[PDB]
From Swiss-Prot, chain A:
Signal peptide: none annotated. Changing residue 18 to A: Decreases affinity for histone H3K4me3. It comes from the Eukaryota. The chain holds residues 1564 to 1627 of 3969 of the full protein. This is MLL cleavage product N320. Coiled coil: none annotated. A zinc finger (PHD-type) spans 3-64. The lineage of its organism: Eukaryota, Metazoa, Chordata, Craniata, Vertebrata. Residues 21-37 are annotated as: Interaction with histone H3K4me3. It is found in: Nucleus.
From Swiss-Prot, chain B:
It is found in: Nucleus. It comes from Homo sapiens (Human). Identified in the spliceosome C complex. Component of the XAB2 complex, a multimeric protein complex composed of XAB2, PRPF19, AQR, ZNF830, ISY1, and PPIE. Identified in a pentameric intron-binding (IB) complex composed of AQR, XAB2, ISY1, ZNF830 and PPIE that is incorporated into the spliceosome as a preassembled complex. The IB complex does not contain PRPF19. Interacts (via RNA-binding domain) with KMT2A (via the third PHD-type zinc-finger). The gene is PPIE. This is Peptidyl-prolyl cis-trans isomerase E. The keyword Lipoprotein does not apply. The modification Phosphoserine is found at residues 94, 100. The chain holds residues 1 to 114 of 301 of the full protein.
Amino acid sequence: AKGNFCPLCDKCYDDDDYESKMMQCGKCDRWVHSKCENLSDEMYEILSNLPESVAYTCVNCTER
Amino acid sequence: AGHMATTKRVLYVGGLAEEVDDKVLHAAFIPFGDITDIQIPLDYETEKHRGFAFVEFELAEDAAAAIDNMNESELFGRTIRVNLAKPMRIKEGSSRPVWSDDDWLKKFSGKTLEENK
Ligand SMILES: [Zn+2]
Ligand SMILES: [Zn+2]
């Protein structure tokens, strides 16, 4: 495992998650901040609203 | 060559083989100018992309050179396609993507608009 939280920073499930542009993985339930993934805001909205067949995954469901 | 707008944000890529990864998109897109981000979405059962991906430049002019030259480029033995991806900023907080290049991403999932609600 690599923790049930964003491993790319020391932040956690805190109340600030609204502007942290968080996203849930699609084959595991871990949540991650998209800002730590170096993703732009529009880039985030696209890969977050991609179809249910194809989409981006967390650092343990795929290497990035 | 030509384009609908120069833009300064991320751009679209397609016609890729499943063997393509960010290291292939970086080496093929870096000669026009500096890149700052590349990501490939994947299919949940095979961990492969359907031949579509995204790229982001550090400069707005070099992104216009990508759509002007890489749209005729070739990778893995097949032709690729490149175009802008700024005129598709999602209307999150009001509706899902159904009105732009993001709509054809839904048509790509398999029509889907016959059940949109
Ligand atoms: Zn984080
Ligand atoms: Zn995951």
